Amino acid sequence: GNTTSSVILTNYMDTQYYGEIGIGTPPQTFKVVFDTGSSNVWVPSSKCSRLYTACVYHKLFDASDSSSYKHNGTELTLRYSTGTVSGFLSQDIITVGGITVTQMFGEVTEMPALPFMLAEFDGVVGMGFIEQAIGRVTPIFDNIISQGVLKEDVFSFYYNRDSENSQSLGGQIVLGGSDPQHYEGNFHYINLIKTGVWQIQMKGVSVGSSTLLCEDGCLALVDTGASYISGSTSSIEKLMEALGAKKRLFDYVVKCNEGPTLPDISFHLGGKEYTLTSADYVFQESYSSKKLCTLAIHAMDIPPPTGPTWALGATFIRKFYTEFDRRNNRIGFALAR
Ligand SMILES: O=C(c1c(Oc2ccccc2)n(-c2ccccc2)c2ccccc12)N1CCNCC1
Ligand SMILES: *[C@@H]1O[C@H](CO)[C@@H](O)[C@H](O)[C@H]1NC(C)=O
After folding, report:
1. Which residues form the active site?
2. CA spacing 20 to 30 A to 140: which of 132, 173, 195, 318?
3. Ligand 2 atom having least distance to the Cα of 138
4. Distance of CA 106 from the midpoint of ligand 2 (Å)
5. Domain 4-178 has CATH 2.60.130.10
6. Is residue 225 within 6 Å of ligand 1 at its C-beta?
7. How far is CA 330 from CA 132, 194, 326, in A?
8. How far is it, in rounded angstroms, from Cα 127 to Cα 93?
9. Which of 2.40.70.10, 1.10.10.10, 2.60.410.10, 2.40.50.140 would CATH assign to domain 179-336?
10. Does ligand 2 have an atom closer than 6 angstroms to the CB of 329?
11. How many whole angstroms from 7 Cα to the centroid of ligand 2?
12. Where are the domains of the chain?
């Protein structure tokens, strides 16, 4: 192939990065997260009961308004770390950054308020492998590859640190390459443990100068759909005791004045150390001892076969521009700019 294609992303509060796709003829536009942690495409359906408040608030796909729609109707349930969606399969034309593909996707009829009422996006575009696709449906990137239009069998993620001011650009996905404008230095590559999952070996997790965690190795899922860096409950409990952080319901907190005093956290991947300073992992919203500041690291127990794993989400990608290489089954990291 010859072409490169980009998807402009919106950065919502440093936690949600989403772009727009079109589905059907004429195109019905949806805000979607592009998720390397999963392999299914889904959007909410017009068939979703309005008793699900998430379906009242999000954009719904109406098959009755699309002349290119092809019925399927196979029921499917997608169980994610933060919640579950259920619905049925359909086929239609999807437009992603100027690229048009015929795609099988889920029409979601059951969409829980938690977490979906907290989502700025409507659906998900899974960027993982067919091996992880529920119902063994061909993932969108595999269908785009089949077209033979892309210069390379790769895709790259840039997630901006700036979520506020306009004219910044929230983030960017490049289909078929990388954007040198958003990284510096050279890519350092890490081969996948196996095909089918964007997961790599991690050799250790350091808090300051000492390797408190993951000595003897562990797994690291490079997950564009996750807002934070996550580890298993036991790993995070140990990590947080070392930081002096206090557990709450859905996160860990530190007194805001303590934020800048927190140690660096280093991830040992492919012989290189990937270091995040406290500015990279603390939501430093004030400097008061009277206020609590949340950390962009949390516990998430991912079940087998994928888990138990650490997940390197938006917290990590903000610092490290990421290239997902399908041709060589590897992931490249470079310093984002
Ligand atoms: O469930 C999540 C996650 C998720 O939802 C998604 C649901 C489906 C697809 C993508 C995101 N969100 C999320 C973020 C903001 C609002 C609602 C949900 C997470 C926030 C932190 C950590 C994980 C997830 N996963 C599991 C699937 N892969 C990415 C992380
Ligand atoms: C749904 O799609 C798959 C092809 O991807 C097909 O094999 C299956 O039989 C379809 N079912 C119907 C009822 O159209």
Report:
1. 35, 223
2. 318
3. 5
4. 13
5. no
6. yes
7. 17, 9, 7
8. 17
9. 2.40.70.10
10. no
11. 30
12. 4-178, 179-336
Q: Nearest C-alpha to atom 10 of ligand 1 is from which residue?
A: 225
In the chain, the N- to C-terminal Cα span, in Å, equals: 28
Element (H, E) at 267: strand 265-269
From the CA of 281, how far away is ligand 1's center (Å)? Answer: 18
Residue nearest to atom 5 of ligand 2 (CA): 137
Query: What phi, psi does 78 have (nearest 5°)?
Result: -115, 115
- Pick left, alpha or beta for residue 108 (phi over 0 → left; psi -120 to 50 → alpha; otherwise beta): beta
Amino acid at 268: H
Give the chain's count of helices (H) and strands (E).
6, 24
Q: According to the entry, how was the structure determined?
A: X-ray
Task: Put residue 327 in one of left, alpha, beta given phi > 0 → left and psi -120 to 50 → alpha.
Answer: alpha
Beta-sheet pairing, 154-159 with 70-79: unpaired
> How far is the C-alpha of 154 from the C-alpha of 195, rounded, in Å?
14
Of ligand 1's atoms, which has the minimum distance to the CA of residue 116?
17
| Sign of the dihedral through C-alpha 69, 72, 76, 78 | negative
Q: How far is the C-alpha of 305 from the C-alpha of 294, rounded, in Å?
A: 30
**Tokens encoding 307:** 């888990």
For residue 15, give the 3-state DSSP assignment: coil
Question: Which resolution, in Å, applies to this structure?
Answer: 2.9
Which amino acid residue places its CA nearest to atom 19 of ligand 1?
Answer: 226
**Distance in Å, CA 115 to ligand 1 centroid:** 8
